[PDB]
Structure 1
Amino acid sequence: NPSARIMTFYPTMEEFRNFSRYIAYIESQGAHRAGLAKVVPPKEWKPRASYDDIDDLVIPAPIQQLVTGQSGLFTQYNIQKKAMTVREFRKIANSDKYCTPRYSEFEELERKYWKNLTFNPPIYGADVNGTLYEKHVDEWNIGRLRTILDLVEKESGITIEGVNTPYLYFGMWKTSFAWHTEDMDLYSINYLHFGEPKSWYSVPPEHGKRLERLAKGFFPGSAQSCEAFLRHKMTLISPLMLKKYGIPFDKVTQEAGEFMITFPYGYHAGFNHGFNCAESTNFATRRWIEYGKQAVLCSVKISMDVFVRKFQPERYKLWKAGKDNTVIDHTLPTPEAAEFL
């Protein structure tokens, strides 16, 4: 994938059963170069019988998303509102004030989003601790992915809500996620349970330092105050701004019943088309360890010691001494992808 374009995968039921194996396979295809990949699950697979019984589910901390800015460069502020139910949230989402506008092509809706994001602030029902998967679902269960991340909970006992536990995201028209990479530059999985689509923007990991240099130059105040200020997740930058400053990027629309995989150091942002529900968590592969070791944090921290000892014992002394000069190649697939190479 020399173009570093977002790829789409269609695994069969047998191919879908082994999660960590299918991620290794997609890396063997170059999926990781874009920093974002779509996975369309088998038609026979379903994580829940119906979604008609979640009206009474409580969103404890909804946020009114206040956006300030101009010329494709914005700052998002979150105002915590009183706790509301899925019924109360859906009612606001489909109301005349907050409902999705009329559109023919995605391009029209994208223009409507970037033209009106500063007006009529929407409410995001984000960071809800929970899952919508039924107990018996073994295939791609966000709550129990069984990757090497499990070492943090198995060996330390430490729980990081959203990172090694699932999070539910109730979106409406114009709700968004600002430019960011994952905590500790981890991978992420996003399943759109139901509702209107979710559009995504991505910067290939190999061009990730360019977005940072751009972001730094625009917000010199925020950059002097924090080493990794984009981790605050308040910075919105339009595709036109990225096109203007020569930042390579791609776009994709996630429809209900689809998965999105974000890769280590893959910068992403996007917005919700209307009333929807997405389930999210972080995971890892042997390849991620170098990123975790090199990750520039906000001045969430996972101890890398357990990983370095178990998977890089030869490098353990060198890394503790600070003499580990390893330079990351973003084009390289995870060692687990050796069987497909």
Structure 2
Amino acid sequence: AQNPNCNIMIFHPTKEEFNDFDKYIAYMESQGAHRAGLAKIIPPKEWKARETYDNISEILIATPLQQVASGRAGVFTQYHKKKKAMTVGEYRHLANSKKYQTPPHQNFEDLERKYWKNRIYNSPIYGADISGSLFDENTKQWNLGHLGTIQDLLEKECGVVIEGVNTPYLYFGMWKTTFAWHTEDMDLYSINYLHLGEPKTWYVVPPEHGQRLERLARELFPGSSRGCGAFLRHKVALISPTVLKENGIPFNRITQEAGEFMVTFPYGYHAGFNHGFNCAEAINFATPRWIDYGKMASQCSCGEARVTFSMDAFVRILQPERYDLWKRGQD
């Protein structure tokens, strides 16, 4: 069995290997990359996402989100308070302001220590989940707006034609902006490209050990767990690496820098934070190996999770027994 310790693997494809996206995902899995839940892919030196980032300031962040924490430094939830619209140029200036800027630090490890010590005492503002793309239309390799769609994959594997669409999302971050512990919708893969700016630190639990994280979360968030049998679908809970280690939960960590891709694998729980002003692009995708994870994905039916239109068909076809309850939680 390849990668039996479930280490995060880093790949350096050549320009020739960068042509066929599906083939390269299958290659990484042949080497055991999925066992970690997360892999890094460093593009060949010949590749670029677009020519420059000099002309992005007029993108609108319609609903910036202030991420307010509750709890203790290593075990907390966050809620998202909506703020007034602002442009990317306005948001960048805000991120660089004395109130929000990255503090002085020695290295990524010192910054990680400061994040976990101090995150709860501040409320950073995140431009998340903005439909759009920063890949040039002429970028033919690993262009996250030109991937094969999940509806086409389901149709190819299972023969059923379904409605829905699959488009990318932009994320504008600042110091301490935080992504809570989650797997993807329907336990899909994700791919994330860090277009510019400061790094993103990731934490990940191997898919084969995801239920260990779920059991700890039920212990640590006991009211939330009574409210919903899949409350991590709400994407609000944080647990630090120190708490994970104290409770014996297997995990790994890695820092993504600008110009790098990350892939999350089906049922790979992940969480993390941004180091300073940055912009990432991400999208969900599927492969044939995903189908069995999709069929077994947990679902929130309490009303909190609310998701896109396009997830309807996935539940309806893959999980018909669960469909009626889940759809009620969507309405």
1:243 corresponds to which of 242, 245, 270 = 245
Percentage of matched positions with identical amino acids: 64
Q: How many Å separate the matches in 2 of 1:127 and 1:43?
A: 29
Shift of 1:71: 4.9
Shift of 1:156: 2.5
Q: How many Å separate the matches in 1 of 2:164 and 2:142?
A: 23
- Give the 5 Å matches for 1:1-341: 1-146=3-148, 148-151=150-153, 155-159=161-165, 164-299=166-301, 300=307, 301-304=311-314
Q: How many Å separate the matches in 1 of 2:285 and 2:175?
A: 28
Deviations 1:61-84 (A, max 9, x none): 100110111151000010010110
User: Which runs of no fewer than 5 residues in structure 1 stay unpaired?
Assistant: 309-318, 323-341
SS of residue paired to 1:13: coil
Shift of 1:298: 1.0
Asked whether the 8 Å contact 1:66–1:76 carries over to 2, the reply is: yes
Shift of 1:243: 0.2
Alignment root-mean-square deviation, CA:
1.9
Q: How many Å separate the matches in 2 of 1:272 and 1:305?
A: 32
SS of residue paired to 1:15: coil
Asked whether the 8 Å contact 1:289–1:307 carries over to 2, the reply is: no
Q: How many Å separate the matches in 1 of 2:70 and 2:286?
A: 35
Which stretch shifts more, 135-144 or 269-278? 135-144
Shift of 1:192: 0.1
Q: How many Å separate the matches in 2 of 1:206 and 1:302?
A: 27
Q: How many Å separate the matches in 2 of 1:305 and 1:106?
A: 40
Q: How many Å separate the matches in 2 of 1:305 and 1:254?
A: 32
Shift of 1:175: 0.3
Report the count of equivalent residues: 308
User: Which runs of no fewer than 5 residues in structure 2 stay unpaired?
Assistant: 302-306, 323-331
Deviations 1:37-84 (A, max 9, x none): 000001111111100101111011100110111151000010010110
Deviations 1:14-40 (A, max 9, x none): 101100100000000000000000000
Deviations 1:258-300 (A, max 9, x none): 0000000000000000000000000011110011111111114
Q: How many Å separate the matches in 2 of 1:78 and 1:89?
A: 17
Measured at CA, do residues 320 and 57 of structure 1 come closer, stay the same or move farther in structure 2, by a change above 3 Å?
Answer: closer
Asked whether the 8 Å contact 1:149–1:283 carries over to 2, the reply is: no
SS of residue paired to 2:16: helix
Q: How many Å separate the matches in 2 of 1:40 and 1:240?
A: 29
Asked whether the 8 Å contact 1:148–1:286 carries over to 2, the reply is: no
Measured at CA, do residues 302 and 288 of structure 1 come closer, stay the same or move farther in structure 2, by a change above 3 Å?
Answer: farther
Shift of 1:136: 1.4
Please, what TM-score do these two structures have when normalized by structure 1? Answer: 0.86
Measured at CA, do residues 304 and 120 of structure 1 come closer, stay the same or move farther in structure 2, by a change above 3 Å?
Answer: closer
Q: Give the ranges of 4+ consecutive aligned residues of structure 1 lying more than 4 Å apart after TM superposition.
A: 151-154, 304-308, 319-322
| Equivalent residue letter for 1:46 | K
Which stretch shifts more, 183-192 or 135-144? 135-144
